Design a binder for these strands. Structure first.
Ligand SMILES: [Mg+2]
Ligand SMILES: [Mg+2]
Ligand SMILES: [Mg+2]
Ligand SMILES: [Mg+2]
Ligand SMILES: [Mg+2]
Ligand SMILES: [Mg+2]
Ligand SMILES: [Mg+2]
Ligand SMILES: [Mg+2]
Ligand SMILES: [Mg+2]
Ligand SMILES: [Mg+2]
Ligand SMILES: [Mg+2]
Ligand SMILES: [Mg+2]
Ligand SMILES: [Mg+2]
Ligand SMILES: [Mg+2]
Ligand SMILES: [Mg+2]
Ligand SMILES: [Mg+2]
Ligand SMILES: [Mg+2]
Ligand SMILES: [Mg+2]
Ligand SMILES: [Mg+2]
Ligand SMILES: [Mg+2]
Ligand SMILES: [Mg+2]
Ligand SMILES: [Mg+2]
Ligand SMILES: [Mg+2]
Ligand SMILES: [Mg+2]
Ligand SMILES: [Mg+2]
Ligand SMILES: [Mg+2]
Ligand SMILES: [Mg+2]
Ligand SMILES: [Mg+2]
Ligand SMILES: [Mg+2]
Ligand SMILES: [Mg+2]
Ligand SMILES: [Mg+2]
Ligand SMILES: [Mg+2]
Ligand SMILES: [Mg+2]
Ligand SMILES: [Zn+2]
Lengths: 120, 86, 51, 17, 102, 49
RNA sequence: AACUCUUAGCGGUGGAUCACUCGGCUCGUGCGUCGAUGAAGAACGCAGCUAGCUGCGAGAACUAAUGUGAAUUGCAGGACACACAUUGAUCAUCGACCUUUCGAACGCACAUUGCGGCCCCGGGUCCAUCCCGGGGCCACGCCUGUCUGAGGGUCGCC
RNA sequence: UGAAAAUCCGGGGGAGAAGGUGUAAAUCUCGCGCCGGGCCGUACCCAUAUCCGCAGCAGGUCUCCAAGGUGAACAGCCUCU
RNA sequence: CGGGCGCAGAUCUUGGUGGUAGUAGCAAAUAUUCAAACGAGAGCUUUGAAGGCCGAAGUGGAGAAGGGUUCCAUGUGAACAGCAGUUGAACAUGGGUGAGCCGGUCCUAAGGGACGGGCCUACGCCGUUCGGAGGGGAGGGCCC
RNA sequence: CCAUCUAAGGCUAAAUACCGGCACGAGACCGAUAGCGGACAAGUACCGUGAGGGAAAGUUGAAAAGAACUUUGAAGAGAG
RNA sequence: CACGACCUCAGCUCAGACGAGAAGACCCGCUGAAUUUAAGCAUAUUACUAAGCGGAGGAAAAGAAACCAACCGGGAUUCCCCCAGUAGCGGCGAGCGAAGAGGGAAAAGUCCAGCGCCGAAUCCCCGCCCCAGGGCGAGGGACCUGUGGCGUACG
């Protein structure tokens, strides 16, 4: 139940470690009603946060595989798209705002403001 | 009569809990809440009541998904990268 | 009633005859799973730590 | 709790002769 | 044009013109633009309408048919709307400019 | 009444769990600053609608 | 004697006054960003002992990551914490991840946790029907394109 | 002139299906057998102290059950549970 | 030098306290009584006996609406229950509502309200079996 | 006669505004009947069928060292 | 629709997108009162304000003259000072009330249709190849009822 140690493991052993932490948390809820003890109930929060870091590694691993899977695809799932804000997502992209028509391309070529200076 | 002998016949609810504002203002017969305007698509607010607007404005609740926009704005809505590991 | 009956058949491997659900006044649902006659609820309660 | 003050809840009087 | 641009929320009204008349009805034709079509966003002479500031331009007095009713212009005829709208001019001419050293 | 809806019964469950007295260890934790729950309601004096 | 009044001491009642101030008010400056990728608001739930408030969402009083470098605290107590040297307590920051139900709320409706349909998966059934469980979907308006069409509406060829 | 609808059934109808000499089609269980029936409410008060009227307020609040004697009586008076 | 700068009044505002005052009052629907137990404490709790009332259009036994834990057991007697209390609908700690065949769910009644259309500058409103190219079930092997 | 512009199509920064929001600095201001209704579990408790209405409430001490123990009372509450 | 083209109009849980709500101090478009003043009151005033409705942005709106001026002429818009409580409006009563010039802040200008030359030289979608930027396909379309280039009152 270490953060950096659950990443080298594979999907089969992470799930096996996940359910073994849930059967341990279920036995703590049984002791909580049966009276339990000090050294026994204080581990409920420890096991709760353990299944949180085990389940975190599982979630953020399958998304990295999906992001590598949809890499280069023209159409990606909505959750894999950049969620900046509703206004930014509806703005002109860098390609569409850099488009310069053939008229102001010639106007910006020979009528661009030059670097000058006045003596006095 | 019109007083004590008439307050005893009050056993029929007129309003109930709404599904949009959680207030006891959903009229049963009219099928329309009297505080949020449900089921109309627009919430009812009126400028002749500054106190009624102060109780249900943006910010009097939690702002779950909006307090995150305030935190992501101060960095430029950075997404897709990770900090330098140790 | 089908999820509760199927859950206890997996958490403890015990067959259930019928389930009687009930939502307690504090909002918690309480179930009454009656085990099959081949299984004894006194032995199961001692294994899972009820007693 | 109760309000500070509450709203409280007829001779014609015309002598003639 | 306000009645057409409201039914089609995903489009922006460009202009309108007159096509038919009657004693009871008047018939017009409203020109709308899909600001998310690639044939319109990839044209530099049409990207101006794809901006967020032109959202529902026909119901703010920005189209040619609705901008006339605002009564703005240049000259002795249009002193009422010097400063943009008639309410911008009315607000300026009624603000008590209390200077710092008056 | 005896005929309740699930939303009403779920609403009465929360108000029933909010009407609990303040834990004893909270009083010693705050140094008798919070001695009694200021939102205790009685079924005869205060109605929740 | 009592009782009534007056003055002073002391003690009650009561809370003024004074001192204190993590609050308000006012002015100025920099920014100036919500939402069908499910917003604001609301509901319910979440701590070993927890009512409220605050913080969070079944990963629920927080997970990962980075910076910081020894605590949390009411009592416990126990740390895959501490002799960090089985790369880390706490805090801060917050580029990863997660985010129940109602709500523009979107299968149809809602004083109902009511009533449906389609596809796929596992089990019961093993005679593919039916039953249970899981997942992906099914609102309205509109744009481009595809497909399937309709009308002697206007024609062409027979 | 004193309700609608879900739902259910009978008849008319004879389109169709069944096999060629012992069975077939079909059976309104036709005698029995096999499997399944989810979700929500369910405690208590219901009124001279659990509702409303600021309250344990001589007020108000929709119904069911209802004994013996006297008497025309569900009147009044008395009695049993 | 700058003021939110001096109170006895405004049936002044807020807070507090007197005389009246141990005063009015605790007077609707017939009733209590003896002994005992528990207890620091008993006209009032509990048990037994006696004597009475409600007298089956009840002071009885169960529901609807409404209330929302008031239900049940144990403990306490500070506050509250307008005297008291060994008692409580109070306080504290635990517990309690189990359905294929009870009801909701299902049906449309009055009525509400989408769809087409019309209307309104608009948010929206009118209208309800009428009105649109409104038919996405059934059968014969592709028909209807 | 003279002067002036070319209507009924489109775009455009900066000077300008900002009692909302995010983050800051300041005060010849208010000092708990004042200043925001809200210095505190405040739009909370609470009232109304509803729209809405809407409070009161800051301070032990430097450190709880928050009074061991004895004693009277059933206990609050007293004496050391 | 015998077999096709087209026009017009439909259907979908068809491929991919878009609109809704919130907030609303400032901003834009409509709608719109009466208290109040006139010592009454009806026009006027309050006010092209409050409330009501719709739509945005970090600013919005306005904006490159169918302008001002009448001069030895100025030269888009916005803002400040001034013009000015002035010209003027008004039971000419109460009251209301701008603008040119001038001094400053900031300054930036431009694109189509039309006119008609260029073999539609134009664009979207789909399937791809190379390192945000460039090509390919005897693919499918849009379009001659007009795409793109030159060009707009300064010629
Ligand atoms: Mg051109
Ligand atoms: Mg009551
Ligand atoms: Mg004397
Ligand atoms: Mg005196
Ligand atoms: Mg004194
Ligand atoms: Mg959601
Ligand atoms: Mg027949
Ligand atoms: Mg019952
Ligand atoms: Mg009584
Ligand atoms: Mg003063
Ligand atoms: Mg005084
Ligand atoms: Mg009496
Ligand atoms: Mg009687
Ligand atoms: Mg309890
Ligand atoms: Mg009881
Ligand atoms: Mg007891
Ligand atoms: Mg008493
Ligand atoms: Mg008791
Ligand atoms: Mg209680
Ligand atoms: Mg413009
Ligand atoms: Mg501001
Ligand atoms: Mg105050
Ligand atoms: Mg404030
Ligand atoms: Mg202190
Ligand atoms: Mg909007
Ligand atoms: Mg007058
Ligand atoms: Mg007068
Ligand atoms: Mg307004
Ligand atoms: Mg600016
Ligand atoms: Mg602009
Ligand atoms: Mg000029
Ligand atoms: Mg002058
Ligand atoms: Mg005027
Ligand atoms: Zn509501």
């Amino acid at each position: 139940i270490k953060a950096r140690d659950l990443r080298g493991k594979k999907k089969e052993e992470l799930l096996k470690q996940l359910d073994d932490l849930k059967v341990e948390l279920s036995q703590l809820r049984v002791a909580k009603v049966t009276g339990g003890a000090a050294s026994k109930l204080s581990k409920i929060r420890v096991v709760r946060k353990s299944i949180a870091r085990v389940l975190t590694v599982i979630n953020q691993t399958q998304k990295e595989n999906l992001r590598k899977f949809y890499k280069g695809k023209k159409y990606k799932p909505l959750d894999l798209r950049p969620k900046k804000t509703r206004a930014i997502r509806r703005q002109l992209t860098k390609h569409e705002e850099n488009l310069m028509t053939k008229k102001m391309q010639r106007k910006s070529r020979l009528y661009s403001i030059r670097k000058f200076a006045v003596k006095a | 009569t019109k007083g004590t002998s008439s307050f005893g016949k009050r056993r029929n609810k007129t309003h109930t809990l709404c599904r949009r504002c959680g207030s006891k203002a959903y009229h049963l017969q009219k099928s329309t809440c009297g505080k949020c305007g449900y089921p109309a698509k627009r919430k009812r607010k009126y400028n002749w009541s500054a106190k009624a607007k102060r109780r249900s404005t943006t910010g009097t609740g939690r702002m779950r998904h909006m307090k995150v926009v305030f935190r992501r704005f101060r960095n430029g809505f950075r997404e897709g990268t990770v900090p330098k590991p140790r | 009633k089908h999820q509760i009956k199927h859950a206890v058949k997996k958490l403890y491997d015990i067959d259930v005859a019928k389930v009687n659900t009930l939502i307690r006044p504090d909002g918690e649902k309480k179930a009454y799973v009656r085990l099959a006659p081949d299984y004894d609820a006194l032995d199961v309660a001692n294994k899972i730590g009820i007693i | 709790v109760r309000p500070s003050v509450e709203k409280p809840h007829p001779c014609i009087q015309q002598p003639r002769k | 044009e306000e009645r057409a641009g409201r039914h089609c929320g995903g489009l922006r009204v460009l202009n309108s013109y007159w096509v038919g008349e009657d004693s009871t009805y008047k018939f017009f034709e409203v020109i709308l633009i899909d600001t998310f079509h690639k044939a319109i966003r990839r044209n530099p002479d049409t990207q101006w309408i794809t901006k967020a500031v032109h959202k529902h331009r026909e119901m703010r007095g920005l189209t040619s048919a609705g901008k006339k009713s605002r009564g703005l212009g240049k000259g002795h005829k249009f002193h009422l709307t010097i400063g943009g709208s008639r309410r911008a001019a009315w607000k300026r001419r009624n603000t008590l400019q209390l200077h710092r050293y008056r | 009444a005896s005929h309740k809806t699930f939303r009403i019964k779920r609403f009465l469950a929360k108000k029933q769990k909010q009407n609990r007295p303040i834990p004893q260890w909270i009083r010693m934790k705050t140094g008798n600053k919070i001695r009694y729950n200021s939102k205790r309601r009685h079924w005869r004096r205060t109605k929740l609608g």
